[PDB]
Amino acid sequence: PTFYRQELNKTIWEVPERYQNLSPVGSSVCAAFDTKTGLRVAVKKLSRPFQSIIHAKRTYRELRLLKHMKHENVIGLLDVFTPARSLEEFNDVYLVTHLMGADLNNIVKCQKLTDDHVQFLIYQILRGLKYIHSADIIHRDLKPSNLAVNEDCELKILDFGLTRWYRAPEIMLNWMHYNQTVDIWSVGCIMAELLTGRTLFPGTDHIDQLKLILRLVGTPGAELLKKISSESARNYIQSLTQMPKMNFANGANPLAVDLLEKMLVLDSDKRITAAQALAHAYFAQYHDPDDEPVADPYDQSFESRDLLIDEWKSLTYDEVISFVPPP
Ligand SMILES: O=C(NCCN1CCOCC1)c1ccc2c(c1)C(=O)c1ccc(Nc3ccc(F)c(NC(=O)c4ccccc4)c3)cc1CC2
Ligand SMILES: CCCCCCCCO[C@@H]1O[C@H](CO)[C@@H](O)[C@H](O)[C@H]1O
Ligand SMILES: CCCCCCCCO[C@@H]1O[C@H](CO)[C@@H](O)[C@H](O)[C@H]1O
Numbered sequence: 001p002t003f004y005r006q007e008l009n010k011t012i013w014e015v016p017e018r019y020q021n022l023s024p025v026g027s028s029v030c031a032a033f034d035t036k037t038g039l040r041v042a043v044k045k046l047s048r049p050f051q052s053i054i055h056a057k058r059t060y061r062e063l064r065l066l067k068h069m070k071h072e073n074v075i076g077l078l079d080v081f082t083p084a085r086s087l088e089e090f091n092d093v094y095l096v097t098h099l100m101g102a103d104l105n106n107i108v109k110c111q112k113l114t115d116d117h118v119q120f121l122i123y124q125i126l127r128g129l130k131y132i133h134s135a136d137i138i139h140r141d142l143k144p145s146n147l148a149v150n151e152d153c154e155l156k157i158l159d160f161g162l163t164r165w166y167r168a169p170e171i172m173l174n175w176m177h178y179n180q181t182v183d184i185w186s187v188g189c190i191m192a193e194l195l196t197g198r199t200l201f202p203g204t205d206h207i208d209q210l211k212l213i214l215r216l217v218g219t220p221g222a223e224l225l226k227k228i229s230s231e232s233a234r235n236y237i238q239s240l241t242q243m244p245k246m247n248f249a250n251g252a253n254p255l256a257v258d259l260l261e262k263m264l265v266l267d268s269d270k271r272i273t274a275a276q277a278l279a280h281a282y283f284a285q286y287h288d289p290d291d292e293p294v295a296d297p298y299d300q301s302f303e304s305r306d307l308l309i310d311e312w313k314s315l316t317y318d319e320v321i322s323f324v325p326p327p
Contacts, residue, residue, distance in 0.1 A: 014083040031099050040099040049093045056312030063319050065161050068298050073128030075156045080323050090317050104144035112197045115253045122191050123286040124155040130274040133180045134294035137161040142186035164209050165199050181271035188263030218245035224267045255282040
């Protein structure tokens with residue numbers, strides 16, 4: 001197609017004519033109208049995609065991830081393009097996705113949602129996670145600003161498989177062997193916040209974050225302590241004034257409360273999974289076991305490769321070129 005060129009976010013964006021009305025939304029992404037499909041779309045121009053091995057692999061990962069994900073509650077690739085006509089001139093990558101029009105913070109505006117609205121919202125998050133997790137992909141930094149939401153409150157998860165208020169405690173402690181339920185922790189934090197209008201653990205800093213979590217969920221149990229090898233870390237922990245798991249309750253729906261108690265567990269092996277959460281009574285209104293799909297297997301064999309820049313770049317080119325838009 002025919003491209004045109006335009007100054008946006010401090011650079012020259014060169015895009016096909018189909019895409020019009022480009023205007024910045026954030027850290028880079030523009031909102032636009034795809035005149036060809038009649039959809040509002042987000043167009044993301046990658047910064048310095050092939051600068052280094054690390055940038056190149058990250059560019060490739062993003063494209064691979066977005067190509068793979070085909071689910072209503074997960075952002076997916078509507079188009080990818082480049083101004084370049086060949087490999088050698090290939091230096092820019094643009095990704096095009098649905099434009100939802102707001103993130104979850106924009107929907108909450110520090111206000112309590114009704115229990116029914118929380119249901120619908122959390123349901124969709126979990127439905128997206130089941131899918132993501134079924135491909136052995138973990139978000140790791142799930143939060144309201146990564147959840148894109150339209151007027152109808154249909155929700156899509158952004159930026160999976162790559163501010164500490166939604167983070168699993170083990171990630172903050174650089175545990176290194178993360179299980180999928182790190183995202184579940186995040187889910188409970190978001191859920192509590194939808195229901196109260198207030199951040200569940202608004203830590204002032206790293207150590208304060210861990211403190212607020214400890215105070216609510218209580219000090220680590222015996223089984224959990226068994227799984228920590230450092231004597232000094234156990235020493236610290238068990239020398240603290242010992243601390244009960246406070247009552248989560250304290251007019252919320254008791255089913256919400258129960259679900260939250262099963263998400264917000266220090267021990268990640270004991271947290272409820274996305275699929276178990278979707279079957280929890282809290283979601284009786286929305287749960288449909290025959291429309292909570294899994295993903296096709298995802299070829300992640302690239303993650304373990306150490307390749308040269310030119311190969312990362314060529315692999316990316318090849319994916320731009322093979323790209324087939326959805327229905
Ligand atoms: O339309 C918005 N307008 C803001 C200005 N106002 C105008 C009108 O009034 C209200 C809004 C708006 C405001 C906020 C948001 C979106 C849109 C949104 O749809 C939206 C859509 C996409 C997006 N990010 C995005 C875009 C393209 C991508 F390729 C990615 N990449 C990833 O998600 C990703 C996935 C896997 C690995 C790595 C990255 C992410 C980020 C947002 C941010 C939330
Ligand atoms: C504030 C201090 C509490 C930190 C306790 C974190 C417990 C995390 O849970 C742990 O997750 C690891 C996966 O990352 C698993 O390997 C361990 O089996 C599991 O116990
Ligand atoms: C207030 C925060 C103090 C909590 C101390 C947690 C330190 C956990 O340390 C973790 O233990 C795991 C199992 O032994 C190891 O696999 C990880 O390498 C290590 O990070």
